Amino acid sequence: ARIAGINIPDHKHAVIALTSIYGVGKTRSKAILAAAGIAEDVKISELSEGQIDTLRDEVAKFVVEGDLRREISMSIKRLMDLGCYRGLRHRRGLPVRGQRTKTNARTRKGPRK
């Protein structure tokens, strides 16, 4: 467990093994392999055969975790006190692309009793 990053899956497909850890997109998770000659097939579970111990800096040399969060939060850097639409909708946990709040809202605040 926790061999590709912060996420717990034991046995995972190699072309998406760097997903769900805040540092790699779906196509990048396959492109990062072919720049190093790494295999694009068969699921991985350990640090064998150079299949992922070769990818530690190639992920970290870009925006990752809080640095990625800060970059996708550039949208509101002029709205960190000014509430105009996106401002207030980020200063509290709120929708920014429309929400039909009278249904389909559990996911915004917490699960039903």
Binding site: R78, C84, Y85, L94
Partner: protein, 79 residues
């Protein structure tokens, strides 16, 4: 989302933008349109927007260009 290389401002506003630094003497531009955007060429001008109840002055700086008057006189409240 495609707006580039020049501001989308009407000719009735261009008659004002040429003489906008007189806004220590001249009173705010009374506007009813809210779909309208703020641009760098407009900096120095004073503007007042109808909030659907009254006209209110809106404070403009070069930091907030590319936003709409409906973001300062808010559309369908909501919080």
């Amino acid at each position: 989302r495609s707006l580039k290389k020049g501001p989308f401002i009407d000719l009735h506003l261009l008659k004002k933008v040429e003489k906008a630094v007189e806004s220590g003497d001249k009173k705010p531009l009374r506007t009813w349109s809210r779909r309208s955007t703020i641009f760098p060429n407009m900096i120095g001008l004073t503007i007042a927007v109808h909030n659907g109840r009254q006209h209110v002055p809106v404070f403009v700086t070069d930091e907030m260009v590319g936003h709409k008057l409906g973001e300062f006189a808010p559309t369908r409240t909501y919080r």
